Amino acid sequence: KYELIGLMAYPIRHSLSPEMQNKALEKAGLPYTYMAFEVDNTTFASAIEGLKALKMRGTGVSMPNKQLACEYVDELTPAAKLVGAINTIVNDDGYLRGYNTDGTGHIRAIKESGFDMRGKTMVLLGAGGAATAIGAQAAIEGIKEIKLFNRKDDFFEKAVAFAKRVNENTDCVVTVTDLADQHAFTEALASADILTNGTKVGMKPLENESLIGDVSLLRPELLVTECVYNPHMTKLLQQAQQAGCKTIDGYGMLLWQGAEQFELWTGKAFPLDYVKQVMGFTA
Amino acid sequence: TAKYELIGLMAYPIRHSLSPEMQNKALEKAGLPYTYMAFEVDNTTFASAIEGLKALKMRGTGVSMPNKQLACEYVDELTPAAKLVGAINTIVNDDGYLRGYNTDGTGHIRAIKESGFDMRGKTMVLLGAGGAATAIGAQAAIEGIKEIKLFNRKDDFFEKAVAFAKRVNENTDCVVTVTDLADQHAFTEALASADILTNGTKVGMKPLENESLIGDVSLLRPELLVTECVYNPHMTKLLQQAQQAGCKTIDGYGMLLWQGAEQFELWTGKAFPLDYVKQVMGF
């Protein structure tokens, strides 16, 4: 009969994955049901037991389990090994494969727009789950250099370690700089082909903030990408659009991220345009 | 919807179970936020499936062959009837505390009760000593039946019948006796004193569909109530003999519907849409 696909996260409040996945599955009439489960670090190992025992087809993974999940799969992709976090598990007859679709999804959205990131230079803001996933995938896709900026918080040392892993295991060049070093930021922005916000700046309670203070730094030839999807148009994207830049919003990454999970689980093509419409992703 | 809770069915194999359709139609009719799904679970994977059930916060699960006996050691509490049977077909998860019930027993008994029959103080001839027969015998004893005259051939279930009889005789006020099906004089005499005859054996179901444990239809007095656990076919040979003799009868679907209704109510705390499900299932 139907096979189950889970989501293992805590809290699972208002995630868009259940609606996206069930709408897509129902569109093609596929024999799967996606359901979210409140699972945290203390219950994750037993949830995986459950995933194997019940013969679940797989599960999505979100906070606080993305790092822990790497230790519960039999095989990780090269990008997931650079990130040290996964958001997708596929159960192939008891053999678990882990993937990070946030990285591939963001890169796909960029590629769909017509931008070729091979040999380009990126200024990446942040060093959490979104930023590291994007940086890892960008490196694998042949981006020349990623100039990563992060403030002096808990993620700074994570950024340093992340850059070390990318520099030693890919041909990409990753640098890490304090967001407070304004001169270095301006210099990096000047050299950039793509600016990517992977921070929580732009999302509530930081919805009225942007890491760009001087819009003249936003040259029209600069591509600006955003991970934040609530609100749909962040302050940064508004600045970028007003400056005449091409942009890619959070829904781009979210949709493609989702498409990739769907395809790994079902082996069928994701009904992208349909999902985009039903989810109201186009303003 | 992400608010939905999961109710499983843990069995092997999962063939033509009517539970998924019944429960989901009923859940939908009531607009309740539950999804019922079947999972292939055997004695080897059952322990881990229960860890899954707790970790994922499933509302509960149906249990069927080959796990009904094993399941008793994985719940925290068993109803008195389940203690007599040594098997459950229902688990309810109340915040991590698991309760085990056997709705096969209560369902068959509810079916009888609905027909207008009062089993308090009555005598039953019970055929068999497997899961269905012991579930019925246990609940009937708890319902106040005076005596259960159980008949079983000399196969692996005969010693089980004896042990079952002892548990019932020692923990209820009901008197249970166990006799060899081959003892025709014993059978004839028990039938003459019976108020109710219940088939809990596989006789009547393929490949024994052309068989009935009643060889002389005159033994079926019109006042005798005949109930049948076999539901495929709907009209067993025994039920045809009984209706032909003027007996009041209860078929396998009576038991199946009420078994289901009781599981639904235990998991949801809401009324089962009985008239609706009877209608949509085709009964």
Ligand SMILES: NC(=O)c1ccc[n+]([C@@H]2O[C@H](COP(=O)([O-])OP(=O)(O)OC[C@H]3O[C@@H](n4cnc5c(N)ncnc54)[C@H](O)[C@@H]3O)[C@@H](O)[C@H]2O)c1
């Ligand atoms: N579109 C998508 O599919 C998608 C996927 C993943 C994440 N996201 C979004 O990306 C954003 C980041 O998520 P994450 O999981 O990577 O978060 P995280 O907690 O893992 O990382 C947070 C990052 O933001 C930085 N940061 C936080 N507050 C800051 C501030 N006031 N100023 C400057 N920097 C600050 C931190 O240093 C860190 O680098 C969120 O808004 C999230 O909703 C979107």
Ligand SMILES: NC(=O)c1ccc[n+]([C@@H]2O[C@H](COP(=O)([O-])OP(=O)(O)OC[C@H]3O[C@@H](n4cnc5c(N)ncnc54)[C@H](O)[C@@H]3O)[C@@H](O)[C@H]2O)c1
């Ligand atoms: N209507 C329902 O909801 C419902 C629920 C449970 C079981 N059932 C039905 O009840 C029947 C028995 O199921 P069970 O799970 O108790 O099986 P079981 O394997 O647990 O027990 C089988 C019983 O049948 C007897 N038996 C088998 N072959 C026989 C034969 N040739 N002659 C005489 N006796 C014989 C055995 O001695 C034993 O008593 C099945 O047909 C099943 O479909 C119906």
